[PDB]
Tab-separated table of all heavy atoms in Angstrom:
chain	number	residue	atom	x	y	z
D	197	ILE	N	-16.632	-4.462	-27.311
D	197	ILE	CA	-15.519	-5.216	-27.898
D	197	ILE	C	-15.935	-6.577	-28.461
D	197	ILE	O	-15.603	-6.879	-29.619
D	197	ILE	CB	-14.324	-5.274	-26.919
D	197	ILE	CG1	-13.692	-3.902	-26.750
D	197	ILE	CG2	-13.267	-6.262	-27.340
D	197	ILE	CD1	-13.648	-3.465	-25.324
D	198	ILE	N	-16.654	-7.380	-27.650
D	198	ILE	CA	-17.095	-8.735	-27.995
D	198	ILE	C	-17.995	-8.815	-29.243
D	198	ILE	O	-17.579	-9.395	-30.244
D	198	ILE	CB	-17.679	-9.472	-26.770
D	198	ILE	CG1	-16.640	-9.540	-25.632
D	198	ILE	CG2	-18.149	-10.871	-27.185
D	198	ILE	CD1	-17.157	-9.912	-24.257
D	199	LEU	N	-19.211	-8.250	-29.179
D	199	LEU	CA	-20.144	-8.262	-30.298
D	199	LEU	C	-19.598	-7.595	-31.574
D	199	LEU	O	-19.621	-8.264	-32.618
D	199	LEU	CB	-21.564	-7.811	-29.924
D	199	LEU	CG	-22.222	-8.644	-28.827
D	199	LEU	CD1	-23.532	-8.080	-28.448
D	199	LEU	CD2	-22.366	-10.107	-29.224
D	200	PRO	N	-19.004	-6.363	-31.518
D	200	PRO	CA	-18.414	-5.779	-32.745
D	200	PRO	C	-17.404	-6.717	-33.397
D	200	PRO	O	-17.470	-6.974	-34.609
D	200	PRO	CB	-17.739	-4.492	-32.251
D	200	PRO	CG	-18.433	-4.160	-30.996
D	200	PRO	CD	-18.855	-5.451	-30.367
D	201	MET	N	-16.519	-7.302	-32.558
D	201	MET	CA	-15.511	-8.253	-32.991
D	201	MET	C	-16.104	-9.477	-33.655
D	201	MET	O	-15.524	-9.946	-34.631
D	201	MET	CB	-14.646	-8.669	-31.827
D	201	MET	CG	-13.319	-9.201	-32.246
D	201	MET	SD	-12.218	-9.349	-30.832
D	201	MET	CE	-12.151	-7.636	-30.263
D	202	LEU	N	-17.233	-10.002	-33.129
D	202	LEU	CA	-17.905	-11.170	-33.712
D	202	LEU	C	-18.594	-10.821	-35.042
D	202	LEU	O	-18.484	-11.584	-36.003
D	202	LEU	CB	-18.891	-11.793	-32.726
D	202	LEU	CG	-18.263	-12.404	-31.491
D	202	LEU	CD1	-19.317	-12.761	-30.477
D	202	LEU	CD2	-17.447	-13.627	-31.834
D	203	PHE	N	-19.259	-9.639	-35.093
D	203	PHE	CA	-19.931	-9.102	-36.274
D	203	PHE	C	-18.981	-8.972	-37.450
D	203	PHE	O	-19.323	-9.416	-38.542
D	203	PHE	CB	-20.554	-7.734	-35.983
D	203	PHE	CG	-21.773	-7.709	-35.091
D	203	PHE	CD1	-22.202	-6.520	-34.511
D	203	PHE	CD2	-22.526	-8.856	-34.881
D	203	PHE	CE1	-23.344	-6.492	-33.696
D	203	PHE	CE2	-23.673	-8.822	-34.073
D	203	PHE	CZ	-24.067	-7.644	-33.481
D	204	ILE	N	-17.785	-8.374	-37.237
D	204	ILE	CA	-16.796	-8.219	-38.310
D	204	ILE	C	-16.298	-9.570	-38.832
D	204	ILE	O	-16.041	-9.717	-40.021
D	204	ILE	CB	-15.643	-7.220	-38.002
D	204	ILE	CG1	-14.862	-7.615	-36.734
D	204	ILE	CG2	-16.173	-5.798	-37.897
D	204	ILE	CD1	-13.410	-7.365	-36.806
D	205	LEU	N	-16.240	-10.575	-37.951
D	205	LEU	CA	-15.833	-11.941	-38.300
D	205	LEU	C	-16.929	-12.619	-39.119
D	205	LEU	O	-16.616	-13.326	-40.075
D	205	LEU	CB	-15.549	-12.754	-37.016
D	205	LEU	CG	-15.251	-14.237	-37.180
D	205	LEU	CD1	-13.834	-14.469	-37.703
D	205	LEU	CD2	-15.494	-14.950	-35.895
D	206	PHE	N	-18.202	-12.429	-38.723
D	206	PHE	CA	-19.329	-13.012	-39.432
D	206	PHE	C	-19.442	-12.414	-40.819
D	206	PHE	O	-19.612	-13.154	-41.779
D	206	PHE	CB	-20.619	-12.909	-38.601
D	206	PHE	CG	-20.563	-13.681	-37.302
D	206	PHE	CD1	-21.380	-13.341	-36.237
D	206	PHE	CD2	-19.694	-14.761	-37.146
D	206	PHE	CE1	-21.301	-14.036	-35.025
D	206	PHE	CE2	-19.607	-15.444	-35.929
D	206	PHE	CZ	-20.412	-15.077	-34.879
D	207	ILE	N	-19.200	-11.098	-40.938
D	207	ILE	CA	-19.194	-10.352	-42.198
D	207	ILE	C	-18.160	-10.972	-43.142
D	207	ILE	O	-18.453	-11.157	-44.332
D	207	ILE	CB	-18.983	-8.835	-41.932
D	207	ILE	CG1	-20.316	-8.189	-41.475
D	207	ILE	CG2	-18.460	-8.113	-43.178
D	207	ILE	CD1	-20.223	-6.835	-40.845
D	208	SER	N	-16.993	-11.367	-42.580
D	208	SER	CA	-15.928	-12.017	-43.338
D	208	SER	C	-16.415	-13.323	-43.991
D	208	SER	O	-16.032	-13.617	-45.120
D	208	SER	CB	-14.713	-12.279	-42.447
D	208	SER	OG	-14.769	-13.529	-41.768
D	209	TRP	N	-17.295	-14.059	-43.300
D	209	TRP	CA	-17.854	-15.338	-43.755
D	209	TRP	C	-18.897	-15.239	-44.889
D	209	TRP	O	-19.256	-16.270	-45.474
D	209	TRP	CB	-18.361	-16.178	-42.574
D	209	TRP	CG	-17.321	-16.559	-41.554
D	209	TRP	CD1	-15.963	-16.461	-41.678
D	209	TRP	CD2	-17.565	-17.090	-40.246
D	209	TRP	NE1	-15.350	-16.865	-40.514
D	209	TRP	CE2	-16.312	-17.293	-39.629
D	209	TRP	CE3	-18.725	-17.404	-39.518
D	209	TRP	CZ2	-16.191	-17.824	-38.341
D	209	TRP	CZ3	-18.607	-17.933	-38.250
D	209	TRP	CH2	-17.354	-18.127	-37.664
D	210	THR	N	-19.340	-14.001	-45.236
D	210	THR	CA	-20.260	-13.815	-46.355
D	210	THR	C	-19.544	-14.164	-47.661
D	210	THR	O	-20.218	-14.516	-48.633
D	210	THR	CB	-20.935	-12.434	-46.387
D	210	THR	OG1	-20.019	-11.426	-46.796
D	210	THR	CG2	-21.620	-12.072	-45.104
D	211	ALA	N	-18.180	-14.142	-47.661
D	211	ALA	CA	-17.351	-14.510	-48.817
D	211	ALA	C	-17.556	-15.996	-49.225
D	211	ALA	O	-17.180	-16.405	-50.338
D	211	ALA	CB	-15.886	-14.213	-48.538
D	212	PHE	N	-18.212	-16.788	-48.328
D	212	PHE	CA	-18.583	-18.188	-48.587
D	212	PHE	C	-19.876	-18.282	-49.424
D	212	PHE	O	-20.258	-19.370	-49.839
D	212	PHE	CB	-18.677	-19.012	-47.285
D	212	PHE	CG	-17.410	-19.023	-46.473
D	212	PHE	CD1	-17.443	-18.781	-45.107
D	212	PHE	CD2	-16.179	-19.274	-47.075
D	212	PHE	CE1	-16.263	-18.761	-44.353
D	212	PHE	CE2	-14.998	-19.241	-46.329
D	212	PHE	CZ	-15.052	-18.985	-44.971
D	213	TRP	N	-20.533	-17.139	-49.671
D	213	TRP	CA	-21.728	-17.054	-50.498
D	213	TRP	C	-21.483	-16.081	-51.653
D	213	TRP	O	-22.420	-15.446	-52.165
D	213	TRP	CB	-22.952	-16.672	-49.659
D	213	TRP	CG	-23.483	-17.791	-48.816
D	213	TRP	CD1	-24.466	-18.676	-49.146
D	213	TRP	CD2	-23.076	-18.121	-47.484
D	213	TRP	NE1	-24.683	-19.556	-48.105
D	213	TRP	CE2	-23.850	-19.231	-47.066
D	213	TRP	CE3	-22.130	-17.582	-46.588
D	213	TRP	CZ2	-23.711	-19.813	-45.800
D	213	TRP	CZ3	-22.001	-18.149	-45.321
D	213	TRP	CH2	-22.774	-19.261	-44.943
D	214	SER	N	-20.201	-15.975	-52.072
D	214	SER	CA	-19.766	-15.116	-53.176
D	214	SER	C	-18.689	-15.788	-54.010
D	214	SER	O	-17.776	-16.408	-53.468
D	214	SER	CB	-19.294	-13.758	-52.669
D	214	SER	OG	-18.575	-13.061	-53.669
D	215	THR	N	-18.822	-15.662	-55.335
D	215	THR	CA	-17.921	-16.199	-56.360
D	215	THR	C	-16.922	-15.141	-56.875
D	215	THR	O	-15.994	-15.478	-57.628
D	215	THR	CB	-18.727	-16.840	-57.491
D	215	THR	OG1	-20.023	-16.238	-57.555
D	215	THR	CG2	-18.853	-18.324	-57.309
D	216	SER	N	-17.116	-13.864	-56.454
D	216	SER	CA	-16.281	-12.730	-56.827
D	216	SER	C	-15.008	-12.707	-55.969
D	216	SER	O	-15.096	-12.356	-54.794
D	216	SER	CB	-17.062	-11.430	-56.649
D	216	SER	OG	-16.233	-10.302	-56.879
D	217	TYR	N	-13.833	-13.079	-56.544
D	217	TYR	CA	-12.557	-13.083	-55.820
D	217	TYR	C	-12.252	-11.692	-55.309
D	217	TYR	O	-11.963	-11.515	-54.127
D	217	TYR	CB	-11.404	-13.582	-56.715
D	217	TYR	CG	-10.042	-13.629	-56.049
D	217	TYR	CD1	-9.857	-14.302	-54.846
D	217	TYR	CD2	-8.922	-13.084	-56.663
D	217	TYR	CE1	-8.602	-14.402	-54.253
D	217	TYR	CE2	-7.665	-13.167	-56.073
D	217	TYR	CZ	-7.510	-13.823	-54.860
D	217	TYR	OH	-6.282	-13.915	-54.233
D	218	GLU	N	-12.382	-10.700	-56.188
D	218	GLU	CA	-12.117	-9.294	-55.899
D	218	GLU	C	-12.958	-8.733	-54.731
D	218	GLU	O	-12.412	-8.019	-53.881
D	218	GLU	CB	-12.056	-8.407	-57.182
D	218	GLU	CG	-12.810	-8.940	-58.411
D	218	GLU	CD	-12.262	-10.148	-59.169
D	218	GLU	OE1	-11.047	-10.157	-59.479
D	218	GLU	OE2	-13.051	-11.081	-59.460
D	219	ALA	N	-14.240	-9.149	-54.624
D	219	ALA	CA	-15.110	-8.744	-53.509
D	219	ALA	C	-14.712	-9.477	-52.228
D	219	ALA	O	-14.689	-8.866	-51.155
D	219	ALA	CB	-16.567	-9.015	-53.831
D	220	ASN	N	-14.399	-10.778	-52.338
D	220	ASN	CA	-13.972	-11.597	-51.207
D	220	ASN	C	-12.677	-11.074	-50.609
D	220	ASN	O	-12.617	-10.837	-49.393
D	220	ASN	CB	-13.811	-13.056	-51.625
D	220	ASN	CG	-15.065	-13.689	-52.125
D	220	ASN	OD1	-16.168	-13.146	-51.985
D	220	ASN	ND2	-14.906	-14.801	-52.811
D	221	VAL	N	-11.664	-10.834	-51.458
D	221	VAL	CA	-10.392	-10.299	-50.988
D	221	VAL	C	-10.644	-9.053	-50.143
D	221	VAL	O	-10.150	-9.002	-49.012
D	221	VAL	CB	-9.397	-10.101	-52.147
D	221	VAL	CG1	-8.449	-8.933	-51.888
D	221	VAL	CG2	-8.617	-11.386	-52.383
D	222	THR	N	-11.538	-8.140	-50.629
D	222	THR	CA	-11.954	-6.933	-49.920
D	222	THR	C	-12.629	-7.286	-48.605
D	222	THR	O	-12.201	-6.779	-47.570
D	222	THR	CB	-12.796	-6.052	-50.830
D	222	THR	OG1	-11.997	-5.676	-51.957
D	222	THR	CG2	-13.332	-4.810	-50.129
D	223	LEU	N	-13.621	-8.189	-48.628
D	223	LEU	CA	-14.339	-8.611	-47.428
D	223	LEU	C	-13.414	-9.114	-46.321
D	223	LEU	O	-13.431	-8.565	-45.215
D	223	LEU	CB	-15.372	-9.696	-47.769
D	223	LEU	CG	-16.779	-9.236	-48.089
D	223	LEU	CD1	-17.556	-10.359	-48.761
D	223	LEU	CD2	-17.501	-8.796	-46.829
D	224	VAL	N	-12.577	-10.119	-46.641
D	224	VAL	CA	-11.680	-10.760	-45.681
D	224	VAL	C	-10.549	-9.839	-45.191
D	224	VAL	O	-10.312	-9.741	-43.978
D	224	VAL	CB	-11.197	-12.170	-46.142
D	224	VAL	CG1	-10.465	-12.897	-45.020
D	224	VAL	CG2	-12.374	-13.017	-46.608
D	225	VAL	N	-9.890	-9.146	-46.113
D	225	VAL	CA	-8.805	-8.250	-45.746
D	225	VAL	C	-9.285	-7.086	-44.861
D	225	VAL	O	-8.741	-6.899	-43.762
D	225	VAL	CB	-8.033	-7.818	-46.990
D	225	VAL	CG1	-7.130	-6.645	-46.689
D	225	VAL	CG2	-7.248	-9.002	-47.558
Side-chain angles (χ1 to χ4, degrees):
Chain D
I197 291 124
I198 302 165
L199 302 175
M201 202 168 300
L202 294 170
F203 289 164
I204 58 143
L205 174 76
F206 297 157
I207 281 165
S208 88
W209 299 347
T210 74
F212 302 133
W213 285 267
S214 165
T215 26
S216 174
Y217 180 53
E218 24 288 312
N220 299 348
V221 149
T222 299
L223 268 165
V224 190
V225 166

